[model samples]
Target: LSVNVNRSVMDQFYRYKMPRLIAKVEGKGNGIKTVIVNMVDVAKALNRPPTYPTKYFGCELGAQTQFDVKNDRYIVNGSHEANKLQDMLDGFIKKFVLCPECENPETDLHVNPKKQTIGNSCKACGYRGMLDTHHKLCTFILKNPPENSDSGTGKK
Candidate 1:
């Protein structure tokens, strides 16, 4: 059921995304089919689970929908479905795009990190970099000195 609903909603979103899908199909090909919403926090809220107000007990009676809301805008169950629409566009660009710096296609992706040794030398270009420490610990830069302090680091 979820898959079908996801598909239908995705279809609605796809149609909403590209009104010319039927006509653009030839030009788009596999490119258009994979386009989809990125599913951020705001997009998750649009379908509020029905028992919201009663559960909240008149505390705030807030909205419960997804959107890329600004400070002034807050839509509970908000319809900023545009965020999803934007992702479809982004997905198309990302999958087909090459890295501008190294001309590397799909450079942002890596494979089988655990099987890959720590500080593995990149075979293709020999770019030297360490293993990724884990998501939370990834806040800091890898090497080189502090920024703007002129600590003799070649980063700049």
Candidate 2:
């Protein structure tokens, strides 16, 4: 199933859409965790790395998150419901995906390794600025920057 990337948009024809978050609970008790099965697809739609949202969930839920990029696996400690994680993903999209100025999902995140900062520019409105640095996810982003921060035009 797919849903509007920006849940606030009610238009049936809304262009930006992502696969619904699919979570699978594994193990039991202390070792239990929820794995986001479609995080890669979801992140691709948002134009952000899968690790960002997966880490955001960890920060928000105070749970540990693990990422195996090669295996396309992202896990958060504890058993989280798909609906709950889906709602959490909305928060991630709002903070990192949507353009602050135009509210469009067409935005690119730029990381300044020297300054340890993250900036984003909107392709739709030409709005560019630094992102909030207080979020814990910002630290994770700084440590693991996006692979292609400068090449946005090549892809459709």
Candidate 3:
């Protein structure tokens, strides 16, 4: 895992938004589940400028990453940042779905399965040569999730 690894907006904000939205629908107070918005998405939505290079990696390298997320045992939006967000989102679905060898909302989980010695292809890259092969990809995301906030590892 990378040193900059942190939880993604998927869990910190998006997924957490569900309960809050539900509570709001039922006329409840603020929900306990915290919601950490993705500044990047906000920036894009509001047409804000980025202060620095936001993507850790792009599709230029053999392993081109995209952007994606999911609600079940499949890729959703294909954020391609899966490798970066795995530390937080792994087994999220399996907690109930129980699909072993799972990929995730931000991790590569369903690429290759059951080919004992050699078989795994990253959709992000043409890294089809062997199983457990070195991934030639990376991600571009907010690097730190501060404990104080629901997301980001910024110095307080």
Who wins the TM-score comparison? 2
When 1 and 2 are scored with lDDT, the better candidate is 2
**Candidate 1 C-alpha lDDT tens digits along 1-156:** 544555324554443452221111111322222221322222344433223222221123232332233642222331224344345445434432323332352233332334442332344564434434453212222222223333755664
C-alpha TM-score for every candidate: 0.20, 0.44, 0.16
On residues 1-156, what C-alpha lDDT tens digit does candidate 2 reach at each position? Answer: 586577435557667554667778899437788777766677777657567445656777678787775886777877888888768756655765644485764777788766667887777777778765366455556776544455566763
For candidate 3, write residues 1-156 as lDDT tens digits. 656545332355543343211000111122221111343444455555232322322222122222324521111122323244443333333342221332332233222223323233444444434333222221122122112435676765
TM-score of 3: 0.16
lDDT of 3: 0.30
Please name the candidate that would achieve the greatest lDDT relative to the true structure.
2
Clashing pairs in 2: none
Model 2 ranges with Cα > 4 A deviation: 1-22, 25-79, 145-156
lDDT of each: 0.31, 0.68, 0.30
Off by over 4 Å in 3: 1-31, 39-88, 92-119, 122-156
Better TM-score candidate (1, 3): 1
Q: Give residue 23's lDDT in candidate 1 (0 to 100).
A: 10
| Candidate 1 vs candidate 2, TM-score winner | 2
lDDT of 1 at 154: 68
Better candidate by TM-score, 2 or 3: 2
